[PDB]
Amino acid sequence: GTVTDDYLANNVDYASGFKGPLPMPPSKHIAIVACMDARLDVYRMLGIKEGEAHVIRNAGCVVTDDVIRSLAISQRLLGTREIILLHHTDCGMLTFTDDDFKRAIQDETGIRPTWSPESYPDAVEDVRQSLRRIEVNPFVTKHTSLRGFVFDVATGKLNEVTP
Amino acid sequence: GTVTDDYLANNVDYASGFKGPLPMPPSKHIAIVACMDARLDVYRMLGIKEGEAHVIRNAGCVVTDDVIRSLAISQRLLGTREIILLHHTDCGMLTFTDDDFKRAIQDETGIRPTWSPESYPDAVEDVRQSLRRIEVNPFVTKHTSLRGFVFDVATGKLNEVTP
Ligand SMILES: [Zn+2]
Ligand SMILES: [Zn+2]
Numbered sequence: 001g002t003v004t005d006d007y008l009a010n011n012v013d014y015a016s017g018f019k020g021p022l023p024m025p026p027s028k029h030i031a032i033v034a035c036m037d038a039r040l041d042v043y044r045m046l047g048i049k050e051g052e053a054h055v056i057r058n059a060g061c062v063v064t065d066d067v068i069r070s071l072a073i074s075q076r077l078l079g080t081r082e083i084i085l086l087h088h089t090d091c092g093m094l095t096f097t098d099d100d101f102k103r104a105i106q107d108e109t110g111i112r113p114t115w116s117p118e119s120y121p122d123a124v125e126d127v128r129q130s131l132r133r134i135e136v137n138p139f140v141t142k143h144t145s146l147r148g149f150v151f152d153v154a155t156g157k158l159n160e161v162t163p
Numbered sequence: 164g165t166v167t168d169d170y171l172a173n174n175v176d177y178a179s180g181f182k183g184p185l186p187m188p189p190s191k192h193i194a195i196v197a198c199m200d201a202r203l204d205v206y207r208m209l210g211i212k213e214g215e216a217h218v219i220r221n222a223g224c225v226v227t228d229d230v231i232r233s234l235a236i237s238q239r240l241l242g243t244r245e246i247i248l249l250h251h252t253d254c255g256m257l258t259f260t261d262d263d264f265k266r267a268i269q270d271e272t273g274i275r276p277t278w279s280p281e282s283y284p285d286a287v288e289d290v291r292q293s294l295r296r297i298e299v300n301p302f303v304t305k306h307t308s309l310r311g312f313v314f315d316v317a318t319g320k321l322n323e324v325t326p
Binding site: 002003004006007008009010011013014015017018020021022024025026027028029030031036037038039041043044045046047048050051052053054055056057058059060062064065066067068069070072073074076077078082084090092095096101104105109111113114115116117118138139144145147153154155156157158 | 165166167169170171172173174176177178181183184185187188189190191192193194199200201202203204206207208209210211213214215216217218219220221222223225227228229230231232233235236237239240241245247253255256258259264267268272274276277278279280281301302304307308310316317318319320321
C-alpha cells in the first residue's frame with residue numbers, strides 16, 4: 001500500500017515493546033529545535049531516550065513564532081531550562097531564495113503566501129541569527145543553557161556555533 | 164555538566180558508527196507532523212530509517228503557518244507526497260487555555276504575545292480540525308495521502324481519525 005500503510009504496520013511492532021505511560025514533563029528539562037531534514041534522527045544523534053526531551057522541528061531549524069510559542073510552552077508549562085538548536089550541512093534552506101519560491105507558488109496557485117519561506121545562505125551564520133532571535137525574545141527567557149550546533153550529514157558529528 | 168554536555172558526548176558515539184551522506188529528498192516521500200512531546204519517539208513509533216521522512220514537530224501538533232511553510236517546502240522542493248499528522252493522548256495542549264497563558268505572560272513581561280498559544284480541548288477533534296486546515300490550504304496540495312492519528316501514550320498504538 002502506501003508508506004503510511006507500512007509505517008502503521010511498523011507501529012504494531014513498536015507498540016508490542018512499548019513501556020508507558022510516562023510523565024509529561026521532559027525528564028531532562030531540555031528542548032531541542034532541529035531541521036525537519038530526513039537525514040537527522042535527533043533521538044539517535046544525541047542519545048535521547050523516551051520521556052527526556054522536547055523536540056521541535058521545522059524546515060531549516062528556523063526560530064519562527066511557532067518555535068517561540070513551542071519554547072514558551074515547554075519552559076513555562078513543562079519546566080524545560082536548556083535549549084539546543086540543531087542546524088546541519090547540506091540544508092534545503094540553502095538551495096532556494098524566498099522571492100523565487102513565492103513567485104513559483106503564485107505562478108501555480110494564483111496566490112502569494114503570507115508567511116516568509118525563511119531561506120538563508122549560510123547555516124553557521126544562521127545558527128548565530130537563530131540564537132540571537134531566542135536571546136532577544138521576551139517570552140523565552142527561562143533557559144540556563146542556549147547552545148547551537150551544525151550537524152555534518154556526512155560524518156554525523158556536531159560542531160558548536162558561538163555567537 | 165549539563166544535559167547538553169551529555170547529549171554531545173552521546174553524539175561522539177553516534178558519529179563513530181555513522182554512515183552518510185544520504186540524499187536530501189526523503190526517500191519515502193512523506194512528511195510527518197507531530198507534537199514535540201517528550202514521550203513521542205516519532206522514528207521508532209513508525210519504524211522510520213534515516214533519510215526516509217521529514218519530521219515536523221511543535222507544541223500540540225498544531226498546523227501553524229510554520230507547519231504549512233515546512234510542508235510546502237517539503238512537497239514543492241523535496242518531493243514529499245504523503246502527510247501523517249500525529250496528535251497524542253495526555254497532550255500538554257489540553258491542560259491550559261490561550262487567554263490564561265497570554266495573561267500569565269503579560270503579568271510577567273508587561274507584554275502580551277501577538278501569536279496564539281493554540282491550545283485545544285480535545286485531541287481527536289483537533290486532528291479533524293488540523294486535517295481541515297491542510298485540506299483547505301492552497302499551498303499544500305501535492306499529497307496523495309493525508310491521514311491523522313492519535314498516539315496513545317499508555318499503549319504506544321496509533322488510532323486513526325476520520326476527517
Ligand atoms: Zn535542513
Ligand atoms: Zn502534545
